[PDB]
């Protein structure tokens, strides 16, 4: 009788905070992961200790290929197998690295466009075909002021705005809402050094600090809740004003 | 200890639903009105029966004039006098009517640009000068880029209000004051507009071919003032059931 | 006969470059000015020496007041009195200065909202009521969504001007009048600004690390009024060397 | 030899043909890329070469996404250097367009709609820049934010193309390469379409109740590649007759 949600890339960082906060709200969860098997199993163990039979894991690579549609169908199917329903899809998984214009390029394309855009589209198709239903896409507040040399990443995130709009329009007559949450700087890349992390922190007007994963998850919670039942096609920036700051 | 909010144009329709919902969340509220004294007092009586001394009214005309700055200063002061603090400003009051390019024009300017943009700007200055979880929410319009025919001054005022939302979010972020917007599409239809004209609009909305209730607008305001939006500033949330996505 | 154009704020800087380029394209021009009478008369003299009876001046304050509608009416009338027709209006005049949230405030509203938005609206109404390739070009700002700190009234006026561009393109299309904007990033820096500060702005621009020339701004205006933009209405072209794409 | 050269993708018919012709009229030598329309492409190249010898060649390539697309896009750019010794302008015009309802395999639909609309432009942009008034013009869509029902993959590819236009403008600005877009609204309508359906679209356009000609779209491309646009990068000019301003 509890609703169920799929969260992609939910083993760590922002997807983990979203899975935790959905679980705290009453949801049963599918924790999708690609490589982070130990962290995924550890999170599902922690949620199941809190309410038994309320969490499963589901492994899949979201890189574009001719078998991506079957993998995305399987992610949705795993929610129905464990819980008998699927009320919420959160498209959180994402590849992120530079692709300068001046891995082979076709693998770069498959990974950055597949995880950020194609996989969300196919998960959206499988979600809708299997049916307060809603989908939330993790977008990027800086998509119009992009990082230098991130053209494929930026293309995938713009494509994800277009999917949020197109699917909100096409799925409205089934009662499925589709919206996005657009972080600015939240948890900084593990690879990143401390002086560089501070450099980004200092650009944020509201507090000169990055968003916690929980602050990002809070906006996801609102969008799936009964307090957003007339909201579809909207993207909420959660960026502390970063996107307002000129060069 | 209980936070306090000012809601402009709070006697009826969307501003009333926002004042009720804040009061329900535990805020003390200033109900601002221009011509609707009876309705504003009736709301205040209903809220003070629930919790004593938690709602006052405040009269002001928000037309642009040489006295609008004094009027905006008084609205904010009335919150500080009644409650000792002012944590939230909701700029909800709005004039709305057509102004064909082909009332004197300068009166139309004073109402459509004065209430919709200049009063928000002056209220924002007074709110910020007199300064927690402090935030301002501006009622924007989700159809600002696909405007109604012959509504140029209205459309100009609502675009100015987006500019104020972004500029004030940037400038007040250092003070811990967040500034955001909520942009309805079709909500409560204008009372005058015929019931056939209203049906035409409802049928265009993707989500449930109906208008937003006022309470659905109020729900987004409540989120943006809450501790769940503490990193959000300069954001405008559309609450339009998808209407702004629909091509001609 | 040659077509005719009004350019507001045309005595110096970008408005001068626009009047010169329209004149070199074959237009008769009304050179509007406020304070710069010597520079205005000097430019008309230069253009008249190149072709006689092709340039006049017209003085008007574009600050908002109860007489702004008459002054805007008179600017348009001056083009009809001089040249028998008015084909193009360029809304270039602009006040620009900080208005921190934390002159009287009502004077700042009247200047920054009057010159940047209300005057363009009233000149658009008079241009359309007095009515081939008719169009209006509004000088907008490429950085309206990443505003300079403490410039809220200026930013509000330039957002209102984007609103007017869209609303008037919509409403005047049935009459064959196109309405478009040109949005500079950094072009001619303010006269008062020191070289050190000008260089800080230059270094932000991806394309060439320099500001736009007045002539580069004028080239986009010339395109939008030309027969090469006959299907373009409601468009704002940024001429900013990529500045608006640069993150913090 | 001193004449510049341009690649136009999908140039055998319709918009891409009108862009190839106008570039050639301006003094460019042209590579006419095609996929299936060999007879039309050769017919165009022959007409252009009759006008001026040795100024047009054709180049065949499928721009669907695949492991060989990178090599194909490299060869299109290479064909311009082999034919003409230089490549000054890339116009990304080729486009697949058909509905992909959420409720041909889906992976073919992905390869065709995302490869032609977005990945091929990116690979062509990489190859163009690696081999270097240089500029790229991408054919975008004015109605991206108000999309046709059941066109999600087409709409995703055209949003990805906006992102490429902005990202590549920022990254290539240090090499002097400008990157811009032209966004038609409704231009030449599908061959198949009955006049009664074409009229439903025509009627929605404010400026003239008609679609843009291919020439009107080509005119905006000519402006962006010209010396009149030398400070413009990262901008998308809508050429849509006001269509995108019209609410449902
Ligand atoms: N963090 C920020 O500052 C920020 C800023 C703007 C936008 N965002 C957006 O917010 C979302 C969450 O951000 P984040 O920093 O938490 O993300 P992240 O840690 O960079 O990535 C999230 C997860 O995505 C999964 N992933 C990557 N490649 C994949 C593939 N090929 N197949 C399947 N899964 C794959 C990984 O799962 P495994 O670990 O299981 O391999 C990874 O843990 C992302 O969509 C991001 O673009 C974040
Ligand atoms: N209703 C919708 O569907 C919709 C759609 C888009 C945007 N919005 C926006 O949402 C907000 C609320 O909408 P609504 O329909 O509830 O608004 P509304 O009923 O049109 O007006 C709200 C209140 O504004 C006050 N007001 C009007 N002119 C004024 C003046 N010169 N001085 C002081 N107050 C004045 C009036 O208060 P008194 O009654 O006390 O005189 C009025 O009751 C507005 O900002 C509006 O622009 C609403
Ligand atoms: N310059 C830039 O880098 C830049 C950047 C972004 C946007 N823009 C926009 O591009 C346009 C041209 O820029 P600019 O730097 O050439 O403009 P500007 O020199 O700052 O102003 C142009 C003219 O505006 C007129 N003006 C000011 N207040 C007025 C009033 N109350 N009544 C009537 N006229 C008034 C003045 O005429 P008098 O001298 O006769 O008094 C002035 O010469 C402006 O709209 C500006 O906002 C410029
Ligand atoms: N027409 C409009 O109303 C309109 C509206 C909005 C945007 N646009 C945009 O404007 C541009 C031109 O419009 P249009 O109507 O002229 O285009 P179109 O006729 O639909 O297509 C242009 C050419 O694209 C090529 N193309 C299609 N699939 C391809 C593939 N898999 N590989 C390589 N080339 C392929 C085809 O070449 P072959 O014929 O040689 O196979 C076709 O002739 C397009 O980007 C379009 O999206 C047009
Ligand atoms: N999947 C993810 N998407 C995003 C998007 C934005 C951000 S924070 C902003 C930011 C952080 C790092 C850089 C940067 O230059 N990173 C280098 C880099 C390359 C590959 C992996 C990790 C970091 C640029 C912008 C973080 C993430 S995580
Ligand atoms: N009417 C006018 N509007 C504008 C708008 C922008 C610019 S250039 C950028 C700029 C110039 C001065 C300042 C400043 O702080 N004074 C900040 C930014 C110059 C002008 S002149
Ligand atoms: N490659 C191309 N991209 C586009 C984009 C828009 C248009 S005209 C608008 C339109 C025409 C036909 C349909 C249709 O449903 N078929 C929908 C919209 C035509 C084209 S052709």
Automatic annotation (TrEMBL), chain A:
It comes from the Eukaryota. One of its GO terms (molecular function) is nucleotide binding. Pfam families: adh_short_C2. SUPFAM superfamilies: NAD(P)-binding Rossmann-fold domains. PROSITE patterns: ADH_SHORT. The modification Cysteine sulfenic acid (-SOH) is found at residues 58, 72, 147. The active site is at 140 (proton donor/acceptor), 153 (proton donor/acceptor), 153 (proton acceptor). Keywords: Nucleotide-binding, Oxidoreductase. InterPro entries: NAD(P)-bd_dom_sf (IPR036291), Pteridine_reductase (IPR014058), Sc_DH/Rdtase_CS (IPR020904), SDR_fam (IPR002347). Substrate binds at residue 134. CDD domains: PR_SDR_c. NADP(+) binds at residues 12-14, 34-36, 61-63, 92, 94, 153, 157, 184, 186-187. NADPH binds at residues 13-14, 34-36, 61-63, 92, 94, 153, 157, 186-187. Belongs to the short-chain dehydrogenases/reductases (SDR) family. This is Pteridine reductase. It comes from Trypanosoma brucei brucei. The lineage of its organism: Eukaryota, Discoba, Euglenozoa, Kinetoplastea, Metakinetoplastina.
UniProtKB/TrEMBL annotation, chain D:
NADP(+) binds at residues 13-15, 35-37, 62-64, 93, 95, 154, 158, 185, 187-188. Substrate binds at residue 135. Pfam families: adh_short_C2. The keyword Nucleotide-binding applies. The modification Cysteine sulfenic acid (-SOH) is found at residues 59, 73, 148. The active site is at 141 (proton donor/acceptor), 154 (proton donor/acceptor), 154 (proton acceptor). Signal peptide: none annotated. Keywords: Nucleotide-binding, Oxidoreductase. NADPH binds at residues 14-15, 35-37, 62-64, 93, 95, 154, 158, 187-188. InterPro entries: NAD(P)-bd_dom_sf, Pteridine_reductase, Sc_DH/Rdtase_CS, SDR_fam. GO terms for molecular function: nucleotide binding; pteridine reductase activity. Belongs to the short-chain dehydrogenases/reductases (SDR) family. This is Pteridine reductase. It comes from Trypanosoma brucei brucei. The gene is PTR1.
